[PDB]
């Protein structure tokens, strides 16, 4: 469900479209 997401949400909270930063590198 979250999964193939729940990655990337660590990604959202590293403040990834703050930064410009690719998802899950």
Known sequence: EEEA???YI???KQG???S???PPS
Do not use: K, T
């Open 5 to 7: 997401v729940r990655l």
């Open 10 to 12: 660590q990604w959202l």
């Open 16 to 18: 990834g479209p703050s």
């Open 20 to 22: 410009g930063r690719p």
